[PDB]
Structure 1
Amino acid sequence: GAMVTAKKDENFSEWYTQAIVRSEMIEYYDISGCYIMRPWAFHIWEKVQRFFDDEIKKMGVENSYFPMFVSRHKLEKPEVAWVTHYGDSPLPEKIAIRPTSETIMYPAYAKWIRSHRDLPLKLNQWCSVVRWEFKQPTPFLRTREFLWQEGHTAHATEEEAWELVLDILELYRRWYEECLAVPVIKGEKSEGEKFAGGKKTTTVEAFIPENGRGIQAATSHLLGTNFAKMFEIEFEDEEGHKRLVHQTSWGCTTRSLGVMIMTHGDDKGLVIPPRVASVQVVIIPILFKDENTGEILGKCRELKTMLEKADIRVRIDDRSNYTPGWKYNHWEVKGVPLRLELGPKDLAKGTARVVRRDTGEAYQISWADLAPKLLELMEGIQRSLFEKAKARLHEGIEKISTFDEVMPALNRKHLVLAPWCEDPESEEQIKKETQKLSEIQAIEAGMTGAMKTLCIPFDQPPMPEGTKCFYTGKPAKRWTLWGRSY
């Protein structure tokens, strides 16, 4: 036995640790800020990787592999780990482990691009990167080493590069919403939060109700011609004039797994959406001592064969030395979306008993109907997980008009949607003021408190003219989404 015992709504940090440890998703490691990704989590990564990989291939993006090292000269042209020695011997100049690969890839782009016939150039890589913050890590969400993909494209015009930025952002919306059943908000980052050196940064943002925090889920940047100028990346049109290329950068990490875990989990542990579950259906035979155990197990194998013909991912837990109750809890903790139970009474009726992980509802299904009924049940579970999560997202955002509605909203663990003048100085003033007010409240009470922009959403509600900015009183420009954050 091993059950989750912290409650998700009472001690959220302990609950999250129990849910990912007791389900065997992660293991700790002697170097702080790094975690081991065990197969139960890694299978989910492989599934979303396959999804995204297939979609970018349809766009003409190709995979590649660039070195993990970058020279001091190129990098600084900051949370970076430096290699200064090979064995006993001092490197003649220190080299960094990649935090991101713009400065690794771009010198090569400048060599490869000569003519408009070389554009567009579209590359991606799957690798890990290192960002060495000396603050406390969170499994999946903030770690010193993490797996990601990063794509990098170059175009003859700004408009084509922007079109690609938005197409990729839509793929990230599908990664979260269609595979992981996590609702996200598309938007533009503020000038203070956009990618250093870029022109415009787009994002999809997620929300964690139990601590009130927004979290950036993935990112797609219009670099414009800024990096082209730094690295001298130019092409000749068909008339022979040299022009800078226009570039994009975009990435998504194993952070997505953590967001999925927090979104769907419950007091019993993980709940994995059917579309990414490596086991969608666990078959548990009931194995009384005084029964025809061979016949029961034979029928479980037949059912498995039948379900796999419909591309359902099935595992039979025929372990003799554990009870069905033990098995129920074991696969509940691991988040398997459907359990199928089969005992001598079911065999006698030609049915199976099926229990859905999200709600506990049980069904009796004839064997003839099993494959289509289970297909529709998984699609219902997927949809239900998304819709419930989406309603929590919408309950979690307060539309406000002025600044002293902020702290009450933040104390409800909500995000705020507010008209903003988008002046860069005001974002830093707001972060400092909300941090300060959070400190005072902590002292009245017996993990940063600051509120920052999460994004300026693509979906703008009506902006009546004359609407003033909630903090400066200046004319508002757009509705901006703010909250505490990761």
Structure 2
Amino acid sequence: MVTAKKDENFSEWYTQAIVRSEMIEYYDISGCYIMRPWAFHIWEKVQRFFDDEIKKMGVENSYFPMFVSEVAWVTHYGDSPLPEKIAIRPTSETIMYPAYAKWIRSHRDLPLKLNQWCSVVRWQPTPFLRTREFLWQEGHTAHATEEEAWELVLDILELYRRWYEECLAVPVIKGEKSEGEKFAGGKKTTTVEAFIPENGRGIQAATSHLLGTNFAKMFEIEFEDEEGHKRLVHQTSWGCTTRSLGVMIMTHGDDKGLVIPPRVASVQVVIIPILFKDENTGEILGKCRELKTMLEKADIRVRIDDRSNYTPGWKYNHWEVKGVPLRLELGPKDLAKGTARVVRRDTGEAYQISWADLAPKLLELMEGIQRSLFEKAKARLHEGIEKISTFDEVMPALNRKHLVLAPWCEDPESEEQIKKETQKLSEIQTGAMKTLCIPFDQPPMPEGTKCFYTGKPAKRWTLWGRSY
């Protein structure tokens, strides 16, 4: 059972929700966690979804060593030292890019498209959101042209929007990072941003980089043009991590614990046979098994919780804290009437559905729930963004736990100034406010509109806020 209130002690509510739903287990190296089936199976769903979509695009998977010759060093084995100290892979570029130079010779070798599903390590932790060790996906492509490369960068970004909005039901905002927030080696970084109302922080959801040609020049990734001319390749890289799970929990969770969007739920309907005195139990258990079969033929994912060592009441709370969307109760009365009682997790509403009507009615409720979760979350995000024009509007907005959309000249130096300044003021009253992205969806920029900070001509509207 979850006792901490989401809107009162947020970090405590969160720890409760993930721990009490059996998603994680804690561990003696800080920033490292055991990922349990309840969390891992949800990751399987999005992984499957993304994997299928990238295969449609002709992307292939592969696996690279975790060892190369910033860095973390394996220097000893036992007590004997290593004749050469071997590095754990800091980043994949080190290995993939030499290999790309050797595999690419002609335009006939392009585009080259590889992805990896693996875990990675980094070196003040929060489960899912910021960990020393996570699962992710990372893709690296090589093209003959920038247009082709750029088209892939956006296609992936669109898949990341889908992963969040279609699967996780989390609304996200597409945009470019500032010069100071993009990948430093790369030409151009696109991103997806989410928002956590309860502490008003923005959080980067996934990223898709147009890397251009620097790494190609650096690793001599070169190809023969159709006319026989030596050209550099145009590269992209992209990734999305198990952070996405964090955001989903934080977005849809309520006081009773997890709420899982049907489209990614391991168990969509849990069936709970009510036993009170042992005269009707056989018929009841038998019916449930039939309903499971009937529902499964409609692609519904179902688990009968017929464990005899637990009460009906214990089962409700259990499947509620785990966030199963739909609970179906079948007791002696329900059996006699030919019906089942169904309760949605998002709202608590209960329905009495007759056996024949069950598949279509559950299919429909799940769509209702999935959509309802997203729209509620979308409404919240819009409610958390304040359009503003002057810097003095900023601190009052951040105290409302809101983000801000403001006209900015896009001067990198101004962004550092803005970071420092907002940090400084937040202390008097980290607290810093930084660019989250410059949205693809730009409102109009009336002529002569000034940057909200420097007074100079504003170039574009920028999403700002406190951040993870």
Residues 355 and 363 in structure 1, CA contact (< 8 A), matched pair in contact too:
yes
Cα distance per residue 1:417-453 (max 9 Å; x no partner): 0000000100000000011111111xxxxxx111000
Task: Write the distance in 2 (CA, Å) between the matches of 1:4 and 1:396.
Answer: 26
Among 13, 16, 35, the alignment partner of 1:15 is 13
Contact 1:409–1:416 (8 Å) recurs in 2: yes
Q: Quick check: 285-294 or 413-422, which moved more?
A: 285-294
Contact 1:457 1:481 in 2 (8 A): yes
Does the 8 A contact of 1:81 with 1:130 survive in 2?
no
Q: CA deviation at 1:96?
A: 2.9
Tell me, yes or no, if structure 1 residue 291 matches structure 2 residue 279: yes
Task: Provide, for residues 117-166 of structure 1, a one-character-per-residue CA deviation record: whole Å limited to 9, x for no partner.
Answer: 1100000000111111xxx1000000011110000000000000000000
Q: Does 1:102 align with 2:84?
A: no
Determine the C-alpha separation between the residues in 2 that align with 1:100 and 1:304: 46
Q: Which runs of 5+ in 1 are unaligned?
A: 72-78, 442-447
**C-alpha distance 210-80 of structure 1, shift in aligned 2 (>3 A):** farther
**CA deviation vs aligned residue, 1:41-88 (integer Å, no higher than 9, x gap):** 0000111111000000000100000111222xxxxxxx5422222222
Contact 1:217/1:255 (8 A) holds in 2:
yes
1:92: Cα distance to partner?
3.8
Q: Indicate the residue corresponding to 1:74 in structure 2.
A: none
Partner of 2:261, secondary structure, is coil
Return the offset for 1:374.
Answer: 0.2
Residues in 1 aligned to 2:312 and 2:90: alpha-carbon distance in whole angstroms? 47
C-alpha deviation, 1:241, in angstroms: 1.1
Conserved? CA contact 1:269–1:333, under 8 Å:
yes
Distance between the aligned counterparts of 1:216 and 1:449, measured in 2?
17
Measure how far apart 1:99 and its partner are. Answer: 3.7
C-alpha displacement at 1:226, in angstroms?
1.1
Task: Answer whether contact 1:169 1:202 (CA < 8 A) is retained.
Answer: yes
Q: CA offset at residue 93 of structure 1? A: 3.8
Distance 1:68 1:212, change over 3 A: same
| TM-score (normalizing by structure 2) | 0.99
Q: Is the contact made by 1:81 and 1:131 (CA closer than 8 Å) also made in structure 2?
A: no
Name the TM-score, length of structure 1 as normaliser: 0.95
Q: Which of 216, 220, 232 is matched with 1:232 structurally?
A: 220
- Structure 2 CA distance for aligned equivalents of residues 154 and 342 of structure 1: 56
Q: CA deviation at 1:290?
A: 4.6
Residues 306-340 of structure 1: CA distance to partner in whole angstroms, max 9, x if unpaired?
00111111111112232211111111000000000
What are the ranges of 5 or more consecutive residues in structure 2 without an aligned counterpart? Answer: none
Contact 1:80–1:131, Cα closer than 8 Å, also in 2: no
Q: Deviations over 1:375-405 (max 9, x none)?
A: 0000000000000000000000000001011
Match of 2:453 in 1: 471
Q: Name the SS for the 1:100 alignment partner.
A: coil
Deviation, structure 1 residue 412: 0.6
- For 2:126 and 2:300, the matched residues in 1 are separated by 33
Tell me, yes or no, if the aligned pair for 1:97 and 1:129 is still in contact at 8 Å: no
CA contact (8 A) 1:80 1:130 kept: no
Helix, strand or coil: the match of 1:195? coil
Between the aligned partners of 2:195 and 2:372, the Cα distance in structure 1 is 18
Instruction: Tell me the distance in 1 between the aligned counterparts of 2:370 and 2:85.
Output: 49
For 1:400-479, what aligned pairs fall within 5 Å after superposition?
400-441=388-429, 448-479=430-461
Task: State the Cα deviation string for residues 158-183 of structure 1 (Å, max 9, x = none).
Answer: 00000000000000000000000000
Contact 1:203–1:218 (8 Å) recurs in 2: yes
Runs of 4+ in 1 over 4 A off after TM superposition: none
Higher mean alpha-carbon deviation, 89-98 vs 252-261, is at: 89-98
Q: State which drifts further: 57-66 or 99-108.
A: 99-108
Against the structure 1 CA distance between its residues 388 and 188, is the aligned structure 2 distance closer, same or farther, given a 3 Å change threshold?
same
Question: 2: CA distance between counterparts of 1:96 and 1:460?
Answer: 44
Q: Aligned equivalents of 1:99 and 1:477: distance in 2?
A: 37
Deviation at 1:102, TM superposition (A): 1.3
- Judging changes above 3 Å, is the alpha-carbon distance between structure 1 residues 99 and 263 closer, same or farther for their aligned structure 2 residues? farther
SS at match of 1:275: helix
Q: Report percent identity of matched pairs.
A: 100
Aligned length: 468
C-alpha contact 1:100 1:129 (8 A) present in aligned 2: no
Deviation of the 1:100 alpha carbon: 2.8
Question: Contact between 1:97 and 1:130, CA under 8 Å: does it hold in 2?
Answer: no
